[PDB]
Design an enzyme around this catalytic site. Structure first.
Site, mmCIF file in Angstrom:
data_model
loop_
_atom_site.group_PDB
_atom_site.id
_atom_site.type_symbol
_atom_site.label_atom_id
_atom_site.label_comp_id
_atom_site.label_asym_id
_atom_site.label_seq_id
_atom_site.Cartn_x
_atom_site.Cartn_y
_atom_site.Cartn_z
ATOM 1 N N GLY A 290 3.044 9.739 3.944
ATOM 2 C CA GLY A 290 4.479 9.848 4.122
ATOM 3 C C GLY A 290 5.232 9.095 3.053
ATOM 4 N N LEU B 189 -7.842 -1.785 6.633
ATOM 5 C CA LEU B 189 -9.296 -1.734 6.481
ATOM 6 C C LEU B 189 -9.807 -0.809 5.408
ATOM 7 C CD1 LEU B 189 -10.946 -2.571 9.917
ATOM 8 C CD2 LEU B 189 -10.588 -4.104 8.009
ATOM 9 N N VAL C 189 4.668 9.096 17.549
ATOM 10 C CA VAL C 189 5.608 8.756 18.618
ATOM 11 C C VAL C 189 6.903 9.594 18.543
ATOM 12 C CG1 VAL C 189 6.898 6.770 17.634
ATOM 13 C CG2 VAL C 189 6.140 6.717 20.035
ATOM 14 N N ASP D 109 -4.183 9.536 14.991
ATOM 15 C CA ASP D 109 -4.544 9.322 13.587
ATOM 16 C C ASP D 109 -5.354 8.028 13.308
ATOM 17 O OD1 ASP D 109 -4.746 9.994 10.838
ATOM 18 O OD2 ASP D 109 -2.693 9.349 10.372
ATOM 19 N N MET E 282 8.076 -3.430 10.134
ATOM 20 C CA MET E 282 6.975 -3.873 10.961
ATOM 21 C C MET E 282 6.547 -5.265 10.663
ATOM 22 S SD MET E 282 4.726 -0.395 10.472
ATOM 23 C CE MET E 282 5.344 -0.220 8.804
ATOM 24 N N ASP F 190 7.256 16.839 11.843
ATOM 25 C CA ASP F 190 7.720 18.144 11.349
ATOM 26 C C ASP F 190 8.335 18.014 9.941
ATOM 27 O OD1 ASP F 190 7.115 19.071 14.074
ATOM 28 O OD2 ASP F 190 9.232 18.851 14.662
ATOM 29 N N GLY G 179 0.835 -1.180 0.000
ATOM 30 C CA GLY G 179 0.000 0.000 0.000
ATOM 31 C C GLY G 179 0.868 1.226 0.000
ATOM 32 N N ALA G 180 0.263 2.364 -0.301
ATOM 33 C CA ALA G 180 0.924 3.662 -0.329
ATOM 34 C C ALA G 180 -0.033 4.620 0.378
ATOM 35 C CB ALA G 180 1.164 4.089 -1.767
ATOM 36 N N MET H 123 0.975 -7.817 7.956
ATOM 37 C CA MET H 123 -0.431 -8.186 8.241
ATOM 38 C C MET H 123 -1.022 -8.561 6.885
ATOM 39 S SD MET H 123 -0.905 -7.784 11.560
ATOM 40 C CE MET H 123 -2.749 -7.540 11.801
#
Ligand SMILES: O=c1[nH]ccc2cc(OC[C@@H]3CCNC3)c(Cl)cc12
Length: 312
Positions: A41, A113, A173, A152, A105, A179, A37-38, A108
């Site tokens: 960021g 969703l 986090v 978010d 990460m 920024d 996915g895209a 999944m």
């Protein structure tokens, strides 16, 4: 409310044991398998960590910044090594290499969703009951163990897998990463956050309520549908600035009646109260009739999911 069953502890322990064998993450240790996915960021790729043989999701954020800023971002992301919960996507690590920050990460296999919704058309109430429990629990975990809020919540930040797990990803986090980036959709932002007022976990509850309405009806719910659009789905164009003004100024969206249970309708209505003080809190949501009913339901989420997205 945050206690774990046998199966959850075991899966959590199995993740950390696999993770401890990885070691230092480096660019050249990764083989690209496919694009997952895209979004906000950058792009997320399904990757192979060649040494360990572990399949991971690697998010790349293109950022041209001095070694000063990038070393601070990496240090700030190390907080994610402490976020260990069945309701939060596993984190392998973060590094910088040639203009891009990488966040590695847990993969999944059901994707996010927003993608599942696109495939399904609309998501059934009982399945949304499981999604609600997982989101409430993920947010409670973040608040209780780490004294941080998501900031978010939206369908693209809720990940699902063929084991029937539902997890949150992409919660703020690191200030320095925010920024430097900087762009994200503000369409799930609570009225108080759009008015620059008093914002807590209550603002994440609104975003969850809004994401549930979108998923239940199969459409971003603002502006509300007409009598004709409701007949199309159940039988039975606004620019971003106009939408943000609509959220602040108009009554909150709601589920159509006589299609959803009153417990589900009431649950979303309590998340969508404009006033954050009157809006339900996590503690109240955890004991809402919809949650107690969904918790007692034996729902084959993995079964529904694999059939819907054609997983296999
Ligand atoms: O495999 C998952 N692990 C971690 C992050 C993640 C993000 C997901 O993509 C998020 C994008 C953003 C907007 N559309 C979906 C992909 Cl589809 C899988 C994973």
């Amino acid at each position: 409310e945050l206690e774990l069953d046998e199966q959850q502890r075991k899966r959590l322990e199995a993740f950390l044991t696999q993770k401890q064998k990885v070691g230092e993450l480096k660019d050249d240790d990764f083989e690209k398998i496919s694009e997952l996915g895209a979004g906000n960021g950058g792009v997320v790729f399904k990757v192979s960590h060649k040494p360990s043989g572990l399949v991971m999701a690697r998010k790349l954020i293109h950022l041209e910044i001095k070694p000063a800023i990038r070393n601070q971002i990496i240090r700030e992301l190390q907080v994610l090594h402490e976020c260990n919960s069945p309701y939060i996507v596993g984190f392998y690590g973060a590094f910088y290499s040639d203009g891009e920050i990488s966040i590695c990460m847990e993969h999944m296999d059901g994707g996010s969703l927003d993608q599942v919704l696109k495939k399904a058309g609309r998501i059934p109430e009982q399945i949304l009951g499981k999604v609600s429990i997982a989101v409430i629990k993920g947010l409670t975990y973040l608040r209780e163990k780490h004294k941080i809020m998501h900031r978010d919540v939206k369908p693209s930040n809720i990940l699902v897998n063929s084991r029937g797990e539902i997890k949150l990803c992409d919660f703020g986090v690191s200030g320095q990463l925010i920024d430097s980036m900087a762009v994200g959709t503000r369409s799930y932002m609570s009225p108080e956050r759009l008015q620059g007022t008093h914002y807590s976990v209550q603002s994440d509850i609104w975003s969850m309520g809004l994401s549930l309405v979108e998923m239940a009806v199969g459409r971003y719910p603002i502006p509300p549908p007409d009598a004709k659009e409701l007949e199309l789905m159940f039988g039975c164009p606004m620019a971003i600035f106009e939408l943000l003004d609509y959220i602040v100024n108009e009554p909150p969206p709601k589920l159509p009646s006589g299609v959803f249970s009153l417990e589900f309708q009431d649950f979303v209505n309590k998340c969508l109260i404009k006033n954050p003080a009157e809006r339900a809190d996590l503690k109240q949501l955890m004991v809402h009739a919809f949650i107690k009913r969904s918790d007692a339901e034996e729902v084959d989420f993995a079964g529904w999911l694999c059939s819907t997205i054609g997983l296999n």
